[PDB]
Amino acid sequence: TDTTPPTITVPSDIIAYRGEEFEFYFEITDDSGQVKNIELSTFGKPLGLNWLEYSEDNFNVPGNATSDNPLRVRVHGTVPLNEPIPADKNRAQFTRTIRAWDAAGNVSSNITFVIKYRAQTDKYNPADPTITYVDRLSSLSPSEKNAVEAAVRAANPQIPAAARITVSANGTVTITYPDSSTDTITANRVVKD
Amino acid sequence: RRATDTTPPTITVPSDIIAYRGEEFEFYFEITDDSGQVKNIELSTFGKPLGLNWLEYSEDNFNVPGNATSDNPLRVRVHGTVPLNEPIPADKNRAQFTRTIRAWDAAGNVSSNITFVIKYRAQTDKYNPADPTITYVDRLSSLSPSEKNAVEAAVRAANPQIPAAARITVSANGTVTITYPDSSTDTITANRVVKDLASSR
Numbered sequence: 001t002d003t004t005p006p007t008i009t010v011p012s013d014i015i016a017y018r019g020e021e022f023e024f025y026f027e028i029t030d031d032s033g034q035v036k037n038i039e040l041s042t043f044g045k046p047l048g049l050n051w052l053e054y055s056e057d058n059f060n061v062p063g064n065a066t067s068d069n070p071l072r073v074r075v076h077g078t079v080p081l082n083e084p085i086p087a088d089k090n091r092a093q094f095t096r097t098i099r100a101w102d103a104a105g106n107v108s109s110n111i112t113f114v115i116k117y118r119a120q121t122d123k124y125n126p127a128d129p130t131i132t133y134v135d136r137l138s139s140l141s142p143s144e145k146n147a148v149e150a151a152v153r154a155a156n157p158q159i160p161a162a163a164r165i166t167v168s169a170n171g172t173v174t175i176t177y178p179d180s181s182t183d184t185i186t187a188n189r190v191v192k193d
Numbered sequence: 194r195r196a197t198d199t200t201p202p203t204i205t206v207p208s209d210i211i212a213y214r215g216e217e218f219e220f221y222f223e224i225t226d227d228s229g230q231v232k233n234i235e236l237s238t239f240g241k242p243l244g245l246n247w248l249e250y251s252e253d254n255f256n257v258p259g260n261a262t263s264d265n266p267l268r269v270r271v272h273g274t275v276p277l278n279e280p281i282p283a284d285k286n287r288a289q290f291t292r293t294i295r296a297w298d299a300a301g302n303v304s305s306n307i308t309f310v311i312k313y314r315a316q317t318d319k320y321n322p323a324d325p326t327i328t329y330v331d332r333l334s335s336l337s338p339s340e341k342n343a344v345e346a347a348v349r350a351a352n353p354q355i356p357a358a359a360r361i362t363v364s365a366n367g368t369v370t371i372t373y374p375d376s377s378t379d380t381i382t383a384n385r386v387v388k389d390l391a392s393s394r
C-alpha cells in the first residue's frame with residue numbers, strides 16, 4: 001500500500017529574459033512508478049502567471065515516473081516585454097510552488113521554484129565589429145555611420161534582428177533591444193582615424 | 194592654297210554642366226581645327242591656375258594627325274567629383290565655377306579662352322524620396338526599435354534610386370531623416386510614414 005507522495009526536483013537557475021521564450025523541466029518521481037498530476041501555485045494560491053504553460057503529456061500512466069525515468073514536465077513561457085524590473089535584482093523574480101500526487105492520492109508538500117527575470121541586455125553581449133576607418137573621429141559622415149552599423153550587425157547575428165543599432169557623431173554605438181534595454185559599444189572598439 | 198595654318202582650333206563647350214557633391218560627373222569638349230590636328234588644351238581661370246584639383250581629363254589622342262576634323266572632332270572627356278563638403282552659400286546659384294578653355298593646333302595657333310561653367314549642388318536637390326509603405330505601430334509618439342527598423346527598411350525599399358551611403362534615421366514619432374553622403378537632407382513627416390495599428394486594424 002502506497003502512503004508516500006512523489007518527490008520533485010526543480011531547476012536551480014531558471015533565468016528568463018523579457019520578451020524571449022524560456023523553457024525548463026520539472027522532474028517528478030514516485031515510489032509507485034506513477035505520478036497522476038501536478039499543480040503549480042503561489043504557495044497553494046493561484047499561480048498568477050498567465051504567460052507560463054506546462055505540458056501534461058504522459059500524466060497518470062503506469063511507469064511514467066520511475067527513479068530511472070522520471071516524469072519530465074516541460075514548462076515554457078515568455079516574461080512580458082514590459083515586465084518592470086525592481087531596482088534590487090533579488091526581487092526581480094517570481095517565487096512559486098509545485099506539488100504532485102500519485103495514483104493513491106498521496107500529495108507532496110509545496111516545493112519552491114523561482115523564475116528570475118531580467119532585461120534583454122543582461123543576456124546580450126555584443127561582439128566586436130570589424131573596425132571602420134573614418135575621416136574625423138569627432139564627426140562621422142553618414143556613410144561612415146552606415147558602415148559602423150553594418151559592421152556591428154554582421155558581427156552580431158545573435159542579437160535580435162528587431163534590436164536597433166544607432167551610431168553617434170563620434171562612433172559610439174547604442175544597441176536598443178526590443179524591451180528598450182541597451183548596450184553601448186565604446187567608440188574605440190568601433191572606429192579608427 | 195594658303196602656305197601656312199594661321200587659324201586656331203575651335204572649341205564647343207557644354208552648355209549646362211551640373212554636378213552633385215560627392216558624385217562623379219563628366220562632360221565633353223568638342224574641338225576641331227582647319228588642319229585636322231589639335232595638339233593640346235588648357236583649362237584655366239582666365240589664364241590663371243584652374244584651382245580645381247578634382248577636375249581631370251584624358252589626353253588620349255592628343256596631337257595625332259586627323260584627331261580633330263569637322264566630321265570627327267576631338268572629344269575631350271572631363272570628369273571628377275565635387276568634394277562632399279564643397280561650400281554652398283546662402284544663394285545656391287553662387288555654387289558654380291566659371292573657368293576657361295583654349296586649345297593649340299600643331300602649327301602654334303592657340304584659340305582665345307572661352308568660358309564654361311561648372312554648377313554644383315547638394316545631393317538632396319538630385320534626390321526626391323518616395324513615401325514608404327506605411328508602417329503600423331503601437332504608439333505613434335514612441336516607436337519601438339523594431340518599428341524604427343521597419344520604417345527605415347520601408348523608406349529604403351521605396352527609394353532604390355537614393356544612394357546606399359545615405360543614412361536613414363527615424364525619430365521617436367516616426368519622422369524620417371534621409372541624410373545624403375554630403376550631409377544635405379530630405380525629411381518625410383511622420384504622418385506619411387507611420388499609422389496607429391489599432392486605429393487601422
Ligand SMILES: CC(=O)N[C@@H]1[C@@H](O)[C@H](O[C@@H]2O[C@H](CO)[C@H](O)[C@H](O[C@]3(C(=O)O)C[C@H](O)[C@@H](NC(C)=O)[C@H]([C@H](O)[C@H](O)CO)O3)[C@H]2O)[C@@H](CO)O[C@H]1O
Pocket residue numbers: 238239244280286287288289290291292308
Ligand atoms: C576679363 C577677364 O579675364 N576677367 C576675369 C574675370 O571676369 C574673372 O571673374 C570671374 O568672372 C566670371 C564670369 O566670366 C564669374 O563671374 C566669376 O564668378 C564666380 C564664377 O562663376 O566662377 C561666381 C561664383 O559664385 C563663385 N563660386 C563660389 C563657390 O563662390 C566663383 C568663385 O569665386 C571662383 O570662380 C572660384 O575661383 O566665381 C568671376 O569671379 C576673374 C577670375 O574669376 O578673372 C578675371 O581676369
Ligand SMILES: [Ca+2]
Pocket residue numbers: 002003004005006030031032102106
Ligand atoms: Ca507514492
Ligand SMILES: [Ca+2]
Pocket residue numbers: 063064065069070
Ligand atoms: Ca517515461
Ligand SMILES: [Ca+2]
Pocket residue numbers: 120121122123124125126182183
Ligand atoms: Ca548587455
Ligand SMILES: [Ca+2]
Pocket residue numbers: 121122123124
Ligand atoms: Ca549577463
Ligand SMILES: [Ca+2]
Pocket residue numbers: 149165345361
Ligand atoms: Ca539603420
Ligand SMILES: [Ca+2]
Pocket residue numbers: 198199200201202226227228298300302
Ligand atoms: Ca589651325
Ligand SMILES: [Ca+2]
Pocket residue numbers: 316317318319320321322378379
Ligand atoms: Ca531632395
